[PDB]
Amino acid sequence: GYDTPLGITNPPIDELLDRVSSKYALVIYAAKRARQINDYYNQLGEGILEYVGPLVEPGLQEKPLSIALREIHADLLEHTEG
C-alpha cells in the first residue's frame, strides 16, 4: 500500500486519477484551481470576486498548486469538460 509520500509526490497521483478521467484533465483542473487560489491571496485585501481561496487547511506558505491538488484529493471540487 501507499507508504507515506513526501514532497512532490503527495497526494498520490493514482488516487487523484480516479477523481478525473485522464491525466490531462487533472493537469488543467489543478492549474485552474491554482489560478483561483493565487488570485484570492493576491487580491484578498480588496473585494474578492467569486474566487474561493483555500478550502483545505493551507500550509504556512503552501504553494498554490499544492493546495489545489490536495483539495482535489479530498473531493472538494467539480469540473465540466470542454
Binding site: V52, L55, L76, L77
Partner: peptide
C-alpha cells in the same frame, strides 16, 4: 456547493 457553503 457543499464545500462553498462550508467555507
Amino acid at each position: 456547493e457543499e464545500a462553498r457553503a462550508a467555507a
